[PDB]
């Protein structure tokens, strides 16, 4: 499919964003309610992309 | 300003430290390439 | 080699193993930021 080559690049980019983003959210005084919403969203996306890369593996 | 404290000491330490790691890393690279590499 | 689809990622795969070491080093950046209190 080789859009694969991008679904993976997605997961990699998302990953780098969570890695900086999650600990900054967790220790930030201000907007926790929003921060908490986005972390559920990052996490669900991430789990998704891993399943996507996973399945797509077997095509490319 | 000669004002001390303007750049936090932890940033100075982290950056100088990475500078050292990079220079020393280059020296290790050089052990495997060009003169001294045995090759 | 990695399966060829993943080849583009070779340079990243090469740096990954060192990351756990950067965590030990991170403890010190952090501690310097709270002044080793």
């Amino acid at each position: 499919t080789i859009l694969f080559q991008l679904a993976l690049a997605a997961l990699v980019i998302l990953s780098f964003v969570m890695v900086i983003g999650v600990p900054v959210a967790y220790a930030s005084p201000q907007d926790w309610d929003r921060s908490k919403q986005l972390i559920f969203l990052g996490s669900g996306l991430w789990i998704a992309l891993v399943l996507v890369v996973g399945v797509l593996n077997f095509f490319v | 300003m000669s004002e001390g404290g303007r750049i936090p000491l932890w940033i100075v330490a982290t950056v100088a430290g990475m500078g050292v790691i990079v220079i020393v890393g280059l020296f290790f690279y050089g052990a495997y390439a060009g003169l001294g590499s045995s090759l | 080699k990695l399966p060829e689809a993943y080849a583009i990622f070779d340079p990243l795969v090469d740096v990954l193993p060192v990351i756990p070491v950067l965590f030990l080093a991170l403890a010190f950046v952090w501690q310097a930021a709270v002044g080793f209190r």
């Binding site: 780098f16 890695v19 900086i20 600990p23 900054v24 967790y26 220790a27 930030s28 005084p29 201000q30 | 936090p8 932890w10 940033i11 982290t14 990475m18 | 340079p11 990243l12 090469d14 740096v15 990351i19 950067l22 965590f23 080093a25 991170l26 950046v29 952090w30 930021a33 709270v34």
Partner: peptide, 28 residues
């Protein structure tokens, strides 16, 4: 270059977290 760039990006990240939290009086 590709290797040195991943390295610089990944390496910057840790100090970035500390720097960000420091800047916004976070729970360091």
């Amino acid at each position: 270059i590709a290797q040195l760039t991943m390295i610089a990006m990944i390496g910057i990240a840790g100090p970035m977290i500390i720097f960000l939290l420091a800047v916004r009086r976070g729970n360091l």
